Design a protein around this ligand. Structure first.
Ligand SMILES: Cc1ncsc1-c1ccc(CNC(=O)[C@@H]2C[C@@H](O)CN2C(=O)[C@@H](NC(=O)C2COC2)C(C)(C)C)cc1
Lengths: 104, 87, 141
């Protein structure tokens, strides 16, 4: 089963899919082909939880009926600069304006 | 796999499959691997990207099709983007 | 042009609503006039009696948005084989993002107020030009 994801760091957001049976480490290889940083310089998160390389995406809670094409699930991403890892930082999207009066 | 980068007015960088982004004839013309959108903020362009995924997944499928969700607060700006992007 | 054929051969059909909308079935009579039939709530089914060569289409009962039946615009009952009914699976189309935004905006703004919206004149026309069966019957010709 396919799961549909947004992989997010700072002001970067990757739209992609993967198998429920695929591993965290295999998702880092996907991020490597796009952002050119190797798996050992990546940390992946679900909310505040650091994800383990050998676990499947399904085991970590990304399932086909919660990670949907029209409403994809978020995976946090952090990079290692030099010796140590940065903290997880995901910039929020902009805020919608107030509803115009005719739409209230 | 070939990806492209779509940048919102507030500087958010959305990386999506090239095939997905070609849903828009406007974006095709802007590419021919990065496009800047000076009038589309991130709360709108994120939803645009989600539509591409939805469309590619459900076009030519007999599996029941769910409704594409759009919150009231973003509907007007999203309409304007869809009209510019012809999608 | 588009009208039911007066065959008089019965054909039993299941209208199956697999959309989240309230569905209005429309039969095109022998002069091509659209005749509305009772509505179907979301997810429900009805076993109905129609005829071979008769023509049907399906809309959202509240807004008249277009819906598909067995993946296409029109449904024509055929011969029942083994006394079994014909299934008419009614579903949402994949709407363009523009048409889906128009639907949502139409559901929030009364028609008198479309002109107060801060948009180009062409989008005001697009809103006012709401879905309608007659328009589509002309198109499909
Ligand atoms: C209960 C229900 N819910 C959603 S639709 C529906 C419903 C309710 C009642 C019916 C009864 N069947 C009909 O009216 C069929 C459908 C369509 O083929 C036209 N029709 C006819 O019986 C029509 N008759 C004919 O064509 C006879 C002349 O040769 C057969 C008349 C409306 C002219 C009487 C069909 C569907």
């Amino acid at each position: 089963m396919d799961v549909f994801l947004m992989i997010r760091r700072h002001k970067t957001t990757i739209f992609t899919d993967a198998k429920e049976s695929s591993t965290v480490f295999e998702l880092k290889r996907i991020v490597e082909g796009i952002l050119k940083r190797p798996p050992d310089e990546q940390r992946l998160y679900k909310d505040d939880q650091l994800l383990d390389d050998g676990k499947t995406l399904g085991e970590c809670g990304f399932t086909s009926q919660t990670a949907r094409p029209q409403a994809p699930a978020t995976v946090g991403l952090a990079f290692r600069a030099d010796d140590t890892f940065e903290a997880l930082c995901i910039e929020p999207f902009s805020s919608p304006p107030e509803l115009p009066d005719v739409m209230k | 796999m070939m990806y492209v980068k779509l940048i919102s007015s507030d500087g958010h960088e959305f990386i999506v499959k090239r095939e997905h982004a070609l849903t828009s004839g406007t974006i095709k013309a802007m590419l021919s691997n990065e496009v800047n959108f000076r009038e589309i903020p991130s709360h709108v362009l994120s939803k645009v990207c989600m539509y591409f995924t939805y469309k590619v997944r459900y076009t030519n499928s007999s599996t029941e099709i769910p409704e594409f969700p759009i919150a009231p607060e973003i509907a007007l700006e999203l309409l304007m983007a869809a009209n510019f992007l012809d999608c | 042009v588009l009208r039911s054929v007066n065959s008089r051969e019965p054909s039993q059909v299941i209208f199956c609503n697999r959309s989240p909308r309230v569905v209005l079935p429309v039969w095109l009579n022998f002069d091509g006039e659209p005749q509305p039939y009772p509505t179907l709530p979301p997810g429900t089914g009805r076993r109905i009696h129609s005829y071979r060569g008769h023509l049907w289409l399906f809309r959202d009962a509240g807004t008249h948005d277009g819906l598909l039946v067995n993946q296409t615009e029109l449904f024509v009952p055929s011969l029942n084989v083994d006394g079994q009914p014909i299934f008419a699976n009614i579903t949402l189309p994949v709407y363009t993002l523009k048409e889906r935004c128009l639907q949502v905006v139409r559901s929030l703004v009364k028609p008198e107020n479309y002109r107060r919206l801060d948009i180009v004149r062409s989008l005001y026309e697009d809103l006012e030009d709401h879905p309608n069966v007659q328009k589509d019957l002309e198109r499909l010709t």
